[PDB]
Structure 1
């Protein structure tokens, strides 16, 4: 994995020694070269994972999240370069350095052989994201979110730390490869119940869980575009990756500890999708859509069937691409009308036809139009949860109505109807913006041809 970490670190002398008009071009070029390099991780096997060293490994779960992570950096550099034009050059290089450092943390978070190195890199990803959100977020009003981050630290990552140190003392190792063969059944006891909550609640907030999703339509709103792209595309999926690693140790107690949280997600995707029908803020609507889609990944991990893991990792990759494109479309209107109000600028297909085509395609991938991998992930999760319980199809299908309903409403409000009269700064689409939409959508459409590379280790 050291053929990826070292070029990502060499992006730091590349971004600090570059000429002042060249720092976007150079970082975009070399991060696209790293993303082309990232396809060497597709050397996967039907029995063995790709095990590089004592520190790094890659099965077919971590590999597509790595490719999506290394692909997300050039797109963030394209998306965030317009609204940093009047920024200081040194502050602009600090922004690019925090993006590069976040990629550096993520690409060795997903490959972490041992679980406390996963914990260190997992909680290391929060700091450059925090600095990007609070130094370039264009407004900061976080009176209620401070107490929620305190709740995240109390109920989340610290019990995970104590639990992983406990497994280190009990099993003697936290290597996931060793824990594949030295796993003991975790029986019914109160010690094992608090053990399960400690191993799971950090990743429950990171997904997020319904009821615990209070941070996500704030942190998505108060962020720049690169921060919202990396939150929607990668930083939610650390929770799902960590659940799919840590549920190896949590058998068979998961088979009766999943029942509350499954309810919290199965009803929760009914609520948040419905919440998207009453959103004034477009970026908040995409945030609650992200909650409504990660609820299915929570259910699919907690029911731990093969079809559910295949659908959950396909849904993670697909929703990463789709929701990142949705935030980029929301920014491509916000950079013109200077307000996130979804009822402000209407009828935009009269003014921007190709951009409305991109809105249509991102909406159709948002509502899981087949054969897109949004639908493949959605569908396999629905099949596995039907095998879990035959009634849940109702709570699936009703969600699959409301998921359609706000997806086209977001299309109908922003793009259709009568244009707003008093807005006359609606410029034509820059080639940068259309390139950003295409570099989201065309990989998402090409993955419908060959979905087997995004269906996880047990395809």
Structure 2
């Protein structure tokens, strides 16, 4: 734990002292070293310690950091996917922004204090406002959308944290507190409602993904959407269970509506990144609802399905970024004959699209089975509703694949050696998790 935190603090530190020509190499080495430190944290985490594997405090309640089942999975996932982001991004400015964002996000996951969680997570507010609103390829509207949505939801969460700190005297997770108030429960809930894109607060995610860089999109999809489940398991369910059980019909209404309308909105997309971004929104609802059941199956299934999403959607975003570099287009209608023109890119694209459709040899299958089993434990109709409307995803995925597959094209647009190096780890991890090493 201490080694992981030290390395997380070391990565932004190194950029200040590097030569500004060695920045990429030093950043890549630092990212791999942080991954190794995360593996060490996993090694030193004994399953005998059932509640929390590790807890460290550095002199205050705010400096209390700890790893649990959800935290450990999410932290390993972010440390796994960061190096790919590092290689995809060029320039000292971009490297600095992405390193600071990753440091803040990775410190948020292991934090055990709601106020420190808020402080670390929202520190990356301007960095995305600048990142998504970059000079030539960015849009100011999307940056405004994401920044305002995050600010309002996080401020509601902050108000609830202040009320808890006033009443209980503490806001740390390790101190058992329960509240039945609905205002505080909604204050904590609204952040989850916005951060995990859930209709009708999902509008920020699409505009952000399309106008963010490929490394930015990879991080956003990979771990920033998963921060919702760390907040839910760590800071909402322990204290706000009475409210989630009181509002369960409403929770199901909103979750299933998000699933259905996000699936239907995906059908109206002509941009590849928008297609992947809307697939993410439909995928988040099952996670949110499975956790909300507050059962052993639901929590495990949600964290598993988060890992599956954080291995599948970064791959699709990376492949789309590679294709956009090769073609300078993201419109499906311009892109044809990709099967003949890019056999190696097409194979991986089809593999990852099959993963997104939750086919058996992929982690999404196991994760979906567990989540659907939890929903079936609550009620049969709950699982039946989700299982049927999964067919909408097949329609748009198949239409996109058919449009890209064949036609007449005069351009060889296939990936280079650097690109294949970029996705090889994701493919290997996807296979390893798919065979059951979840």
Q: Fold match, TM over 0.5? A: yes
Q: Using a 3 Å threshold, how does the CA distance of structure 1 residues 429 and 94 change in structure 2: closer, same or farther? A: same
- 2:46 and 2:400 mapped to 1: Cα distance? 39
Per-residue deviation, residues 293-341 of structure 1 (Å, max 9, x unmatched): 0011111122221111111101111101211111111111111221221
Per-residue deviation, residues 274-295 of structure 1 (Å, max 9, x unmatched): 2222210111111100100001
Aligned residues: 428
Q: Using a 3 Å threshold, how does the CA distance of structure 1 residues 390 and 428 change in structure 2: closer, same or farther? A: closer
Q: Using a 3 Å threshold, how does the CA distance of structure 1 residues 408 and 439 change in structure 2: closer, same or farther? A: farther
- 2:53 and 2:171 mapped to 1: Cα distance? 18
The answer to whether residue 316 in structure 2 is matched with residue 326 in structure 1 is yes
Contact 1:372 1:445 in 2 (8 A): yes
Give the match for residue 425 of structure 2: 439
* Structure 1 segments (4+ residues) deviating >6 Å: none
Q: Using a 3 Å threshold, how does the CA distance of structure 1 residues 20 and 115 change in structure 2: closer, same or farther? A: closer
Q: Using a 3 Å threshold, how does the CA distance of structure 1 residues 202 and 435 change in structure 2: closer, same or farther? A: same
- 2:431 and 2:319 mapped to 1: Cα distance? 17
- 1:383 and 1:403 mapped to 2: Cα distance? 20
Give the match for residue 151 of structure 2: 153
The answer to whether residue 6 in structure 2 is matched with residue 9 in structure 1 is no
Give the match for residue 218 of structure 2: 229
Per-residue deviation, residues 199-237 of structure 1 (Å, max 9, x unmatched): 100111000111111111111111111111111011111
Contact 1:312 1:381 in 2 (8 A): yes
Tell me which protein shows more helix as a share of its residues: 2
Structure 2 counterpart of 1:69, from 55, 61, 78: 78
Matches for 1:369-380 after TM superposition, within 5 Å: 369-380=359-370
Deviation at 1:124, TM superposition (A): 1.7
Over the aligned positions, Cα root-mean-square deviation in angstroms equals 2.1
- 1:136 and 1:56 mapped to 2: Cα distance? 37
When normalised by structure 2's length, the TM-score is: 0.92
Deviation at 1:249, TM superposition (A): 0.6
SS in 1 for 2:323: helix
The answer to whether residue 149 in structure 2 is matched with residue 115 in structure 1 is no
SS in 2 for 1:56: strand
Give the match for residue 55 of structure 2: 52
Q: Using a 3 Å threshold, how does the CA distance of structure 1 residues 45 and 297 change in structure 2: closer, same or farther? A: same
Contact 2:362 2:430 in 1 (8 A): yes
Greater Cα shift, 404-413 or 322-331: 404-413
Deviation at 1:126, TM superposition (A): 2.9
- 2:383 and 2:359 mapped to 1: Cα distance? 18
- 1:435 and 1:74 mapped to 2: Cα distance? 11
When normalised by structure 1's length, the TM-score is: 0.88
Deviation at 1:427, TM superposition (A): 3.9
The answer to whether residue 422 in structure 2 is matched with residue 420 in structure 1 is no
SS in 2 for 1:377: helix
SS in 2 for 1:108: helix
Deviation at 1:355, TM superposition (A): 1.0
Greater Cα shift, 60-69 or 48-57: 48-57
- 2:136 and 2:298 mapped to 1: Cα distance? 36
Contact 2:343 2:414 in 1 (8 A): no
- 1:348 and 1:247 mapped to 2: Cα distance? 46
The answer to whether residue 331 in structure 2 is matched with residue 314 in structure 1 is no
Structure 2 counterpart of 1:166, from 158, 163, 166: 163
Per-residue deviation, residues 81-139 of structure 1 (Å, max 9, x unmatched): 4xxxxxxxxxx112111111112112211111222111111212333233322226713
- 2:93 and 2:21 mapped to 1: Cα distance? 15
Deviation at 1:357, TM superposition (A): 1.1
Structure 1 unaligned blocks of 5 or more: 82-91, 453-459
Per-residue deviation, residues 385-417 of structure 1 (Å, max 9, x unmatched): 112221123321123222233333333322x11
- 1:391 and 1:172 mapped to 2: Cα distance? 42
Contact 2:322 2:419 in 1 (8 A): yes
If asked which structure has higher relative contact order (CA below 8 Å, sep 6+), I would say 1
The answer to whether residue 173 in structure 2 is matched with residue 176 in structure 1 is yes
Contact 1:297 1:312 in 2 (8 A): yes
Contact 1:78 1:432 in 2 (8 A): no
Give the match for residue 286 of structure 1: 276
The answer to whether residue 385 in structure 2 is matched with residue 382 in structure 1 is no
Q: Using a 3 Å threshold, how does the CA distance of structure 1 residues 365 and 136 change in structure 2: closer, same or farther? A: farther
- 2:111 and 2:150 mapped to 1: Cα distance? 23
- 1:15 and 1:145 mapped to 2: Cα distance? 25
Structure 2 counterpart of 1:351, from 319, 341, 344: 341
- 1:215 and 1:137 mapped to 2: Cα distance? 20
Give the match for residue 241 of structure 1: 230
Give the match for residue 430 of structure 1: 416
Deviation at 1:62, TM superposition (A): 0.3
Deviation at 1:353, TM superposition (A): 1.1
